[PDB]
C-alpha cells in the first residue's frame, strides 16, 4: 500500500517535471524557425504524453 502510494506520488511528480521541461516556444513570429520549433515541441509533448500514460498504467493494473 504505502510503498506503491509513495512510488505513484514520485512517478506523478516526475511526469509533471517532464511537462515543465517542455515549455512552449516564445517568438510567435514566422520565420521558418518558429514553425520548426513548434513541430519539435509537438513531437516532444506527444512523447511525454505516451510515457506518462504508460508509467501510470503500471499503477492501475
Amino acid at each position, epitope marked *: 500500500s504505502g510503498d*506503491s502510494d509513495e*512510488d*505513484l506520488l*514520485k*512517478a506523478v*511528480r*516526475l511526469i509533471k*517535471f*517532464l511537462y515543465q*521541461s517542455n515549455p512552449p516556444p516564445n517568438p510567435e513570429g514566422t520565420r521558418q524557425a518558429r514553425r520548426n520549433r513548434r513541430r519539435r515541441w509537438r513531437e516532444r509533448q506527444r*512523447q511525454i504524453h505516451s*510515457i506518462s500514460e*504508460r*508509467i501510470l498504467s*503500471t*499503477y492501475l493494473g
Partner: antibody, heavy 117, light 110 residues
C-alpha cells in the same frame, strides 16, 4: 561527444561505506535517466537503480533499496554503497538513456568493487 | 517486481545458422524492451530498442520482435564475431514494477 566514466572501485571490508562516481560529459540533453548496472564476476547484468538528472527522482530495484543511494551532481552521478557485503562484489557500470524511452545507449567502461572479509 | 525470464542459458550454432533468444515478461511492458550484446572485458552494446527497432551501427542480421508478454531476438546469419553473451532489458525505472535484465544467453559459434 557523449561519454560516461566510472571511478571509485576499490577492495573493501564488509560494512565499509563506499561511493562510486559516474563522470557525465558531452551530453546536449539537460534531463535524462542515468542508470546503475552491476555484474558479479562470471554472472549476468543487474539493474541497481537510476536518477532522472534534471530532478531528484531516484528509482531503486527491490533488493537495492536501503543499501544503495544514487545522488545527482552538476557534472556527476554517484552511487553510495551504505553497508556492502560479499554479495556486492561486482563491476559497476553507469548507463545513460538518451531518449527517455527506457533503453541504454551510452555505457561507461565499469569500475570493479571487491567486498572481502 | 518485474522479472524477465531469458531462455536458453547457452546456445551453440554454426556460421550462417539462425539463433533464437526469448524473454518472457512477468508484467505487461509493451515496447519497453531492448537487447544487448556483451563480449568479455567490455561493457554491453545496444542491438534492439522499442522491442523491434534496429539500433544504429548494428548488422541487419539482428532482429527483434514482441507479442504481448513474449519477446524474441533473432540473429539470422550468425557470424564468428557474434560469439558473446546476450541480455534483454524490460520495463521502465519509474514503472510500478521497475526495470530488469534477463539472466542472459551465452552464444558459442561452431
Amino acid at each position: 561527444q557523449e561519454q560516461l566514466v566510472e571511478s571509485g572501485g576499490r577492495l573493501v571490508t564488509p560494512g565499509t561505506a563506499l561511493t562510486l562516481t559516474c563522470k557525465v560529459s558531452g551530453f546536449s540533453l539537460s534531463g535524462f535517466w542515468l542508470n546503475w548496472v552491476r555484474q558479479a564476476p562470471g554472472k549476468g547484468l543487474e539493474w541497481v537503480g537510476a536518477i532522472y538528472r534534471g530532478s531528484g527522482s531516484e528509482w531503486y530495484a527491490s533488493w537495492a533499496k536501503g543499501r544503495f543511494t544514487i545522488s545527482d551532481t552538476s557534472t556527476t552521478v554517484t552511487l553510495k554503497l551504505t553497508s556492502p557485503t560479499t554479495e556486492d562484489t561486482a563491476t559497476y557500470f553507469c548507463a545513460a538513456d538518451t531518449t527517455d524511452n527506457g533503453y541504454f545507449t551510452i555505457w561507461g567502461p565499469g569500475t570493479l568493487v571487491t567486498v572481502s572479509s | 517486481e518485474l522479472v524477465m525470464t531469458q531462455t536458453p542459458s547457452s546456445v551453440s550454432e554454426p556460421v550462417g545458422g539462425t539463433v533464437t533468444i526469448k524473454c518472457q515478461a512477468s508484467q505487461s511492458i509493451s515496447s519497453w524492451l531492448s537487447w544487448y550484446q556483451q563480449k568479455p572485458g567490455q561493457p554491453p552494446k545496444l542491438l534492439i530498442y522499442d522491442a523491434s527497432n534496429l539500433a544504429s551501427g548494428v548488422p541487419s542480421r539482428f532482429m527483434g520482435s514482441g507479442s504481448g508478454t513474449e519477446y524474441t531476438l533473432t540473429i539470422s546469419g550468425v557470424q564468428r564475431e557474434d560469439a558473446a553473451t546476450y541480455y534483454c532489458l524490460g520495463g521502465y525505472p519509474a514503472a510500478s514494477y521497475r526495470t530488469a535484465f534477463g539472466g542472459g544467453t551465452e552464444l558459442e559459434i561452431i
